[PDB]
Amino acid sequence: ADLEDNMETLNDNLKVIEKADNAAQVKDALTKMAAAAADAWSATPPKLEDKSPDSPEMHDFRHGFWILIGQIHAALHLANEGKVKEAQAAAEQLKCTCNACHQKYR
Amino acid sequence: ADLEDNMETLNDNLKVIEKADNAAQVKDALTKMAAAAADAWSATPPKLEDKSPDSPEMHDFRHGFWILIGQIHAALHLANEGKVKEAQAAAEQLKCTCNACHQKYR
Amino acid sequence: ADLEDNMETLNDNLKVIEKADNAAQVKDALTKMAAAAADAWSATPPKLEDKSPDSPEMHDFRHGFWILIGQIHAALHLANEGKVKEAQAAAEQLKCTCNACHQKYR
Amino acid sequence: ADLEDNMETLNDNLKVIEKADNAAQVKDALTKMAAAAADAWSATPPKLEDKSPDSPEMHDFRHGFWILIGQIHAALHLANEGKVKEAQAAAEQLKCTCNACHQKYR
Numbered sequence: 001a002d003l004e005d006n007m008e009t010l011n012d013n014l015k016v017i018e019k020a021d022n023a024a025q026v027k028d029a030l031t032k033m034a035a036a037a038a039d040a041w042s043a044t045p046p047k048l049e050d051k052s053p054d055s056p057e058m059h060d061f062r063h064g065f066w067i068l069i070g071q072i073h074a075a076l077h078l079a080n081e082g083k084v085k086e087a088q089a090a091a092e093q094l095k096c097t098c099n100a101c102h103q104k105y106r
Numbered sequence: 107a108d109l110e111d112n113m114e115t116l117n118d119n120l121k122v123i124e125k126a127d128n129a130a131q132v133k134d135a136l137t138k139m140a141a142a143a144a145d146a147w148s149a150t151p152p153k154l155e156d157k158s159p160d161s162p163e164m165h166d167f168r169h170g171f172w173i174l175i176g177q178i179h180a181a182l183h184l185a186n187e188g189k190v191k192e193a194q195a196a197a198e199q200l201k202c203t204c205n206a207c208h209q210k211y212r
Numbered sequence: 213a214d215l216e217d218n219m220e221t222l223n224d225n226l227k228v229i230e231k232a233d234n235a236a237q238v239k240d241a242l243t244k245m246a247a248a249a250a251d252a253w254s255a256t257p258p259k260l261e262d263k264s265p266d267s268p269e270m271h272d273f274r275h276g277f278w279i280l281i282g283q284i285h286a287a288l289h290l291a292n293e294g295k296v297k298e299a300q301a302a303a304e305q306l307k308c309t310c311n312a313c314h315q316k317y318r
Numbered sequence: 319a320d321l322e323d324n325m326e327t328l329n330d331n332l333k334v335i336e337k338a339d340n341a342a343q344v345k346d347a348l349t350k351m352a353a354a355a356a357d358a359w360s361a362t363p364p365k366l367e368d369k370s371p372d373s374p375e376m377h378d379f380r381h382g383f384w385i386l387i388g389q390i391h392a393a394l395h396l397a398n399e400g401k402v403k404e405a406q407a408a409a410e411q412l413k414c415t416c417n418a419c420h421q422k423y424r
């Protein structure tokens with residue numbers, strides 16, 4: 001799927017996590033977030049569409065999703081352990097990473 | 107694309123890197139390797155097909171790719187700084203990660 | 213060093229970076245920030261001193277440093293490729309991560 | 319707190335994990351490993367004393383500990399979930415990251 005589908009999957013699961021009640025909610029939402037970020041790896045954003053795929057901006061772009069997935073999986077670890085409040089806090093902290101990349105390349 | 111084709115992308119680009127002469131060849135191959143690993147995120151391997159998608163086994167399958175990509179990117183940073191023998195050495199050490207997953211899920 | 217000393221080091225190098233002129237300056241400041249974060253790994257912040265050192269808050273405390281270092285190394289790459297404004301922007305965006313840990317445990 | 323010592327706590331705790339019976343042994347040992355890896359961040363290994371403190375090699379050295387600690391925490395969450403075999407296997411697959419750094423810099 002293209003970047004646009006995947007981003008809007010990222011945003012919706014962040015909200016599912018916020019108005020979540022039980023851990024299963026959060027686990028599934030976090031799992032789907034990790035896949036959407038992984039799926040967005042191949043995409044080239046429009047402002048980088050004239051860059052070559054091994055440029056410093058393009059590399060930082062992909063690296064950003066790699067950091068996001070590491071952060072998603074850590075929150076997924078809190079969800080697996082039944083820590084619903086913590087995973088939700090961890091899910092809200094993800095938008096340092098969402099905003100960082102939007103600022104630079106969106 | 108196909109998990110198989112993704113593995114072939116990793117294996118063949120490992121071959122390019124070993125034979126390469128300049129940093130740009132290795133930089134490019136490493137970048138194609140990270141892409142192939144990200145794409146394989148969505149795959150279910152044949153020996154894990156009758157496990158739950160949220161099983162500890164399918165989660166570990168993905169964690170393996172996250173570690174791989176991190177190591178690929180670590181090898182790219184050396185290539186970026188033009189240390190080609192060092193990047194090629196670092197690319198060789200990746201087969202410990204390829205193999206670690208293979209024992210488990212191939 | 214001190215948790216305080218490590219914070220002030222983190223604080224001072226953000227200012228060095230904004231006021232930098234060349235990539236070597238940003239690179240150097242970023243490298244020290246990462247060292248101060250790793251060094252803080254062992255600290256117990258005053259608001260968590262009566263918590264188990266293996267509690268999810270103390271694990272989350274260290275994890276925050278692990279995320280910060282990842283973000284520092286990502287901005288270091290842009291500086292390594294000599295893109296000083298891009299690195300300066302990325303450095304400033306680390307503050308979102310500083311703030312996140314402060315709201316929880318400062 | 320010296321590199322030699324930090325390596326030695328990493329090696330002994332990986333053996334403790336290898337011989338553990340209950341999760342509490344694994345959790346305690348993994349926790350000590352993550353701490354030793356962070357403590358070694360500042361070291362210059364003997365084979366890199368003729369490089370810039372910010373050479374691509376010295377950065378790649380520090381980066382290895384950052385990837386290691388991530389792997390350590392991922393196995394720790396398995397132990398937290400009382401999955402001792404999975405934690406033990408995760409701890410064993412850690413060798414790739416130990417060996418990779420040894421091959422390059424020991």
Ligand code: HEC
Nearest residue numbers: 004007010011045061064065068094097098101102105106
């Ligand atoms: C972290 C959790 C998030 C969340 C919730 C979102 N993103 Fe991103 N994003 C990136 C880029 C380059 C774009 C532009 C895409 C385009 O212009 O075609 C976006 C876009 C979005 C949107 C708007 C989607 C739309 O329908 O147009 C939304 C809602 C969104 N994002 C949410 C790039 C990145 C990243 C690059 C490394 C990362 C990380 C994120 N975004 C993270 C997130």
Ligand code: HEC
Nearest residue numbers: 110113116117151152167170171174200203204207211212
């Ligand atoms: C690391 C750099 C590598 C390299 C060079 C290769 N792989 Fe993998 N791989 C995984 C699984 C489950 C399979 C089985 C696929 C199936 O049977 O459907 C494979 C397979 C391969 C092949 C064989 C291709 C063929 O058609 O026979 C090759 C050449 C290959 N790989 C190269 C799973 C993983 C991982 C999980 C986390 C990781 C990491 C890797 N593989 C890494 C690598």
Ligand code: HEC
Nearest residue numbers: 216219222223257273276277280306309310313314317318
């Ligand atoms: C993972 C946790 C964490 C992160 C990340 C973090 N901090 Fe802090 N920092 C703290 C805590 C907790 C305190 C309060 C300690 C105290 O009061 O003794 C603190 C204190 C401080 C202080 C004030 C020190 C004092 O005593 O006056 C400054 C300035 C500061 N941090 C800056 C930063 C900057 C800049 C960053 C990021 C670049 C950062 N911190 C990242 C946890 C964190």
Ligand code: HEC
Nearest residue numbers: 322325328329332363364379382383386415416419423424
């Ligand atoms: C990022 C780099 C890095 C990582 C990761 C790393 N090492 Fe090391 N290790 C070194 C270096 C460099 C030395 C050499 C120190 C010296 O010569 O004084 C060393 C030395 C050692 C030694 C002392 C043995 C001897 O004969 O000198 C042991 C034991 C050891 N490492 C075990 C481990 C284990 C176990 C792991 C992971 C679980 C690990 N190392 C991961 C860099 C690393």
